[PDB]
């Protein structure tokens, strides 16, 4: 086989790339869909929507 994984979002909204700096000194990456009020969970903080 040659296998394909597929998903029907059927939409397009702006998003960006974010790197984060915990005051302790941790650095954890993630991709927020900040055009949609999505809530990504990590550690203690959560980032959300933009313009």
């Amino acid at each position: 086989g040659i296998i394909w994984k597929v998903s029907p979002c059927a939409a397009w909204v702006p998003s960006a790339v974010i790197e984060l700096t915990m005051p302790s000194g941790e650095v954890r990456t993630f991709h927020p869909m900040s055009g949609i009020p999505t809530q990504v969970f990590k550690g203690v903080s959560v980032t959300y929507l933009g313009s």
Partner: protein, 51 residues
């Protein structure tokens, strides 16, 4: 043995191994903070002119 398997607790951006995962009833306490405050105070009222 007829067991489900090992447990891992992931809790808000963390990955932690439990020695013993369980639920139980506990003896606790509750607090209260009294509501309300009051104010009054002299004011200067005078009338220069009237129309």
């Amino acid at each position: 043995v007829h067991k489900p398997g090992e447990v891992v607790v992931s809790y808000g951006g963390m990955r932690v191994r439990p020695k013993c995962y369980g639920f139980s009833r506990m003896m606790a306490t509750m607090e209260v903070n009294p509501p309300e405050q009051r104010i009054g105070q002299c004011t200067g009222c005078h009338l220069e002119c009237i129309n």
